[PDB]
């Protein structure tokens, strides 16, 4: 009975990579936050960016039937992403924070602009 058996949970996945962020956007979607977590935490988490070049960073906390989620709006997608990959999986209050990217919704198909 020599070594050999390996991967009880993993069905030999080509890449046992955790969740995927996808495309980098300006709006981020943070989840896995303990009922204790508050805006303050978010601020400090992405505070270094606040001062960084670019308009003040906006933070939003969700408190619906199911708490443990929040959204942060950065000056642009570039900055937003950077912060994500940086704070990707930040253990807080014994919780694995999961940062994601928003999406494009409620858009208009008009444009009076001229050239």
UniProtKB/Swiss-Prot annotation:
Disulfide bonds: none annotated. Signal peptide: none annotated. Residues 26-104 form the RRM domain. May bind RNA. This is RNA-binding protein 41. It comes from Homo sapiens (Human). The lineage of its organism: Eukaryota, Metazoa, Chordata, Craniata, Vertebrata. The chain holds residues 291 to 392 of 413 of the full protein.
